Amino acid sequence: VKDSTEYTGPESYVAEMIRERNLDWFPRMRAMSLVSSDSEGEQNELRNLQE
Amino acid sequence: VKDSTEYTGPESYVAEMIRERNLDWFPRMRAMSLVSSDSEGEQNELRNLQE
């Protein structure tokens, strides 16, 4: 010691206490992805939106 | 025998045981889509981000 956790818380716790431990949570996964999908999120969003 | 489942575980379971069976789961649806939406996800993301 040781420280861390332990110390942280425990120590404180102890011291003190309460809670610590736990809650619930642990493990589961939740995120893982979910936060990893967020990583692709900043990996495509600002890239295309700047390019 | 037979183987497958059976064997696977059962056988072982037996041997052994624990757990196986179951848990919771089954069915529901959851994904289916959901994994299918993931299929569109690789079907557009890397496509546009390479093109």
Amino acid, single-letter form, for residue A12 = S
Is A8 marked as a binding-site residue? no
| Residue stretches of the annotated binding site of B for Ca(2+) | 5
Mapped onto helix, strand or coil, the DSSP state of residue A34 is: coil
The whole-angstrom distance between B43's CA and the closest CA on chain A is 13
The whole-angstrom distance between B40's CA and the closest CA on chain A is 14
Interface of B with A in 1-51 (CB under 8 A): 45, 48-49
Q: Check residue B34 and report its DSSP letter.
A: -
Interacting residues of A40 by C-beta distance below 8 A, sequence separation 6+: B45
Interacting residues of B49 by C-beta distance below 8 A, sequence separation 6+: A43, A44, A47, A48
Nearest to A40 by CA among B48, B29, B18, B3: B48
Measured between alpha carbons, how far is A10 from A12 in angstroms, rounded to an integer?
Answer: 5
Note the residue count of chain A. Answer: 51
Contact between residue A48 and residue B49 where contact means Cβ atoms under 8 Å apart: yes
Note the residue count of chain B. Answer: 51
Measured between alpha carbons, how far is B8 from B6 in angstroms, rounded to an integer?
Answer: 5
Resolution (A): 4.7
